[PDB]
């Protein structure tokens, strides 16, 4: 199947409380495998999945070197944007950055990304062609012009189409057991009486991997999208994911309702009924 590698970076100013906070996390698909936290004692890129613990001091030292540089860049960036938007030194502000690459089921380069937000809004993004930039406002055009002159898109395109996907493929092979696995959802329904004339039927999906899943209810085969309570997919904490979907079923109508589960780990999609 298809895969991704993504890095996510958060930098938050903390005026009068010292240095900005800087958190970096890296993922393959839905599996986190590295982290850096500026506030933590080690001051090192650190492993968070067991397959990357095998990599060795050259790897760990080079990822530490790069993430430390980024922490310092984003310190300057916080001051630069404060200047761009004429903001006071009093307020806390947030810079986020994400980049990464996607490969298709052939494991060849499919798509690459590199984008930023300031205070929760789109600031600048590399467009799909890996050649040009989308700039939100007037501040982001200043950044855009800087990056145009410094040929930042060209450097990124080479990374995203070459290095990024070469290391993704290396991770997928070295971490095959964890990263090329699917855990099928373990499923069940519960039934709880609301009152005398209706009941909640809740369809559960547990311990699945990856996070992508479709969980829907039908009544006589008609989709109940409007009338289903659906929670966000949520992590279990052990690398698997959970989701439920519920409907309110009037008296004697349980047999009309079917829950439908689609997930990569199932040999065929499931149709579950309370009966």
């Amino acid at each position: 199947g298809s895969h991704s590698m993504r890095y996510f970076f958060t930098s938050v100013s903390r005026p009068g409380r010292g240095e900005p906070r800087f958190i970096a996390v890296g993922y393959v698909d839905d599996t986190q495998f590295v982290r850096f936290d500026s506030d933590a004692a080690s001051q090192r890129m650190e492993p968070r999945a067991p397959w990357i613990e095998q990599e060795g001091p050259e790897y760990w030292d080079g990822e530490t070197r790069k993430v430390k540089a980024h922490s310092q860049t984003h310190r300057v960036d916080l001051g630069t944007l404060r200047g761009y938007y004429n903001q006071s030194e009093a307020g806390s502000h947030t810079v986020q950055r994400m980049y990464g690459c996607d490969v298709g089921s052939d494991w060849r380069f499919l798509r690459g990304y590199h984008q930023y937000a300031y205070d929760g809004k789109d600031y600048i993004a590399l467009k799909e062609d890996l050649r040009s930039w989308t700039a939100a406002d007037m501040a982001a055009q200043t950044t855009k012009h800087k990056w145009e002159a410094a040929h930042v898109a060209e450097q990124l395109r080479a990374y995203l189409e070459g290095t990024c996907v070469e290391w993704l493929r290396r991770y997928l092979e070295n971490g095959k057991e964890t990263l090329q696995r699917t855990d099928a959802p373990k499923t069940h329904m519960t039934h709880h009486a609301v009152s005398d004339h209706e009941a909640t039927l809740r369809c559960w999906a547990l311990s699945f991997y990856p996070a992508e899943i479709t969980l829907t209810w039908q009544r006589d085969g008609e989709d109940q999208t409007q009338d289903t309570e659906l929670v966000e997919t949520r992590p279990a904490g052990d690398g698997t994911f959970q989701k439920w979907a519920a409907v309110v079923v009037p008296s004697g109508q349980e047999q009309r309702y079917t829950c439908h589960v689609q997930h990569e780990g199932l040999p065929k999609p499931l149709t579950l009924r309370w009966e």
Partner: peptide, 9 residues
């Protein structure tokens, strides 16, 4: 494996 720089905004 990270990209080497964060380019200045």
């Amino acid at each position: 494996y990270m990209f080497p720089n964060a380019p200045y905004l």
